[PDB]
Write a structure and sequence with these properties.
The structure is a homodimer. Chain A has a seven-stranded mixed beta sheet with strand order 5-11-10-9-8-6-7, with helices on both faces. The first copy, chain A, is globular, with a radius of gyration of 21 Å. Chain A has two domains: 175 residues, Aspartate Aminotransferase, domain 1 (Alpha-Beta Complex); 251 residues, Type I PLP-dependent aspartate aminotransferase-like (Major domain) (Aspartate Aminotransferase, domain 2), CATH 3.40.640. Chain A contains 13 helices and 16 strands. Chain A has 426 residues and is of the alpha/beta class. β4 of chain A pairs parallel with β1 of chain B. The structure holds pyridoxal-5'-phosphate (2 copies) and azepan-2-one (2 copies). One pyridoxal-5'-phosphate sits at the interface of chains B and A. One pyridoxal-5'-phosphate (PLP) sits at the interface of chains B and A. It is classed as isomerase. Keywords: fold-type1, pyridoxal-5'-phosphate dependent racemase, Pyridoxal phosphate, isomerase. It forms a dimeric assembly.
């Protein structure tokens, strides 16, 4: 009878990543509306896909006009204007050069896979560098180089809070890179996949200067540098593109989630020679469909019009300030990290040992949900709270979210172990 | 203010291009695409079958606008949402079905087929697969994976081992199964009309028989209806023409009526075997879901399978008259508004007329008609228009098609060469 019960009866568990019985019938701004009418503040923004929140007027206007008069449904066998305009608008925002082209997909998973397959096709080099704990996607293609393909080389992420080999600079990781590359035929690696802030590892910001150095090693060895900005892309970091923080430019940019503002849309920006090496090669019927592309353009126009990078920078300091405020009261909070409106809070059993508090995290978000706050956890040990709110979230929503979060830290023990065991999580 | 098609060449890479002619679209209304210059073309492609309701259908506009205005979140991964749930129930209500099956939502047929295969392997441990030569299950690593028993599709127009019944294919199947351990094959993937093969309807009874053999061996029958499902065949589900019910149904293309939306209908045990297993962030998103609902609602409301059956016969009847005037036409085939026309150099030899097929669609494009070719040989014109296409739209496209056949020589080899196509 209830919506959550019906979901359990109609929809298989295969795609479920449930942390609590959240059941939604509506949305407005940064709020989700449960079946009964209860309002929750969404600090997850659907893992960041709701870039402009819910029922944003520019999304509404864009998608309504597109549905009323659609330019076909595909970029495969026809050129259509909404996609071409979006392709140029994405091209404009990327420097460079360039000589760069767009590939459109439905998701970050299909875009990382396309990027990979295009590289191997264009160059003949199938080897891949990727980072341990990396999330590039859940398709057979994009999982092949995600964290736990042949010629896959996995490196530790430069994690300040848990430095590899207890070297805080990351120099040991670059040294490992170097040892790994010479154990392998010269010119055999075609690509290096990089998250500028590592999402699934625990929203990890790498040590300053590391990515630039890593890219320089890559460029010196013929290896194309692929920046996977699905989670942290497009203004979320407080800059239009997250690599703008790291003093390097990737050869390839992968975009997703927030790009569609609520509709399935991803994109690969890659040199022309990579995307033109084949035709009819990586394709799905509704790729570059006009409704998705229209929304994508409404996201970009709104980013520019509202200076959303500047907003995300502002609202992110406000959010991190408040979280530090909570640390001063709650011993579980070991680490606050992030850029713009991509923030992570690591919870630990002891601030010195920095041992992961998995059970408390699960109870926390469950309680948070009961109080009216949607937040999910992420990370290797399930101990990292992830904050990726709509970029249009108001300061008033953030204050309210902080009060509810404070309340959820205090009221955590209320959650029984059997309530938590109802929900498999990751 | 360059040409739209030229702007396309400069911004968008070749990787996903399946281009046969310089079609550049700025609008759509019903079964008509509107090019940049304001010429309306009758769409016989319906975007490879995705535009099931055509362009600007009121039901899609109303549902999409309302969904955009008040979205129940953006995902089904981490929240339950009402539109996704309502649509899941509706799809299960359309299948038999009750309490045995569940729904998994995707973006596309490729991911839906990939999810079905991964779920089966995970649930049953049986990784072995049966599939048909020339099959199209999608264009991702996961969906092009299909260890493998490959069979010829039973094509009445091109029999296997000199057996038009198709019974030699059932015999080969029996041999391959006997040759490999019992319980090593988990799944059989079938198109009930083979799309990439060139819209081939198999001989009567073959698939029913094929399904028996599979169940006899503990093998799940997966019916891939991404192209040909949802009212398109003259029934809601194409397997209803075939006298069997599959264990798993894959749906896509027309399902979103223009948005990306796919679905797997599978036994609960297959879909409940693991969690956080096969998932992408925008899966089950409410804007696609609402669009799926509008499609299912319109199918029932404007009796679209019956309309497809009517308009299909009228289309194929018209093409048989073209065959009386144009010797190129060798076989007209299909169910409902999913039709194929195989073009041959001799009707007895059945030798494929590839070169002439390319010119035909290029020519037809110039005339105001959107239509494409498929098949291993590049000689089968696919007809998959909006289920909404009008009786007037059909007659009008038949005249243009007639005119296209008469004017093939007007299109040169150098014009054909400018477009890479397949
Ligand atoms: C979410 C994500 C993906 C995959 O996108 P989907 O839409 O879930 O397929 C890939 N890479 C990163 C870094 C992501 O965050
Ligand atoms: C189109 C199609 C697919 C794949 O759908 P995409 O959206 O192109 O990935 C799979 N099977 C059949 C029969 C199809 O027609
Ligand atoms: O059937 C088709 C044509 C091939 C490209 C993918 C869309 N679907
Ligand atoms: O980072 C995430 C969580 C895993 C499910 C896909 C959405 N993105």
């Amino acid at each position: 009878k209830a919506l959550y019960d019906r979901d359990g009866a109609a929809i298989g568990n295969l795609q479920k990543l449930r942390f609590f019985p959240l059941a939604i019938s509506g949305g407005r701004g940064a709020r989700l509306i449960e079946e009964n009418g209860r309002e929750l503040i969404d600090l997850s923004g659907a893992w960041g896909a709701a870039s402009l929140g819910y029922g944003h007027p520019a999304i509404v206007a864009a998608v309504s006009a597109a549905a009323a008069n659609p330019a076909g449904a595909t970029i495969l066998s026809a050129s259509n204007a909404p996609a071409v305009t979006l392709a140029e608008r994405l091209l404009a925002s990327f420097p460079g050069e360039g000589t760069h082209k767009i590939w459109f997909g439905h998701s970050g998973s299909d875009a990382n896979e396309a990027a990979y397959r295009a590289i191997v096709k264009a160059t003949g080099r199938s080897g891949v560098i990727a980072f341990a704990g990396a999330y590039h996607g859940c398709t057979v293609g994009s999982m092949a180089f995600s964290g736990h393909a042949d010629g896959l080389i996995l490196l530790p992420y430069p994690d300040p809070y848990r430095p590899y080999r207890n070297d805080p600079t990351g120099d040991a990781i670059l040294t490992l890179l170097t040892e790994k590359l010479a154990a392998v035929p010269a010119g055999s690696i075609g690509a290096a996949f990089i998250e500028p802030i590592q999402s699934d590892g625990g929203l990890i910001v790498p040590p300053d200067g590391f990515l630039r150095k890593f890219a320089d090693i890559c460029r010196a060895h013929g290896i194309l540098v692929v920046c996977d900005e699905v989670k942290v892309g497009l203004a979320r970091s407080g800059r239009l593109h997250c690599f703008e923080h790291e003093g390097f430019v990737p050869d390839i940019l992968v975009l997703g989630k927030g790009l569609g503002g609520g509709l399935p849309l991803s994109a690969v920006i890659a040199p022309a020679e990579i995307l033109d090496c084949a035709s009819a090669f990586a394709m799905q019927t509704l790729h570059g469909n006009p409704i998705s592309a229209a929304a994508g353009l409404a996201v970009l126009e709104t980013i520019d019009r509202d200076d959303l990078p500047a907003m995300a920078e502002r609202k992110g300091r406000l959010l991190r300030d408040g979280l530090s405020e909570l640390a001063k009261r709650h011993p579980l909070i070991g680490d606050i990290r992030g850029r713009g409106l991509a923030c992570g809070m690591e919870l630990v059993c002891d601030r010195q040992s920095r041992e992961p508090a998995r059970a408390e995290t699960a109870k926390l978000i469950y309680r948070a949900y009961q109080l009216g706050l949607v937040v999910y956890y992420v990370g290797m040990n399930g101990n990292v709270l992830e904050f990726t709110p709509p970029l249009t979230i108001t300061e008033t929503d953030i204050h309210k979210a902080l009060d509810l979060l404070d309340r959820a830290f205090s009221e955590l023990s209320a959650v029984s172990n059997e309530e938590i065991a109802q929900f498999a999580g990751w």
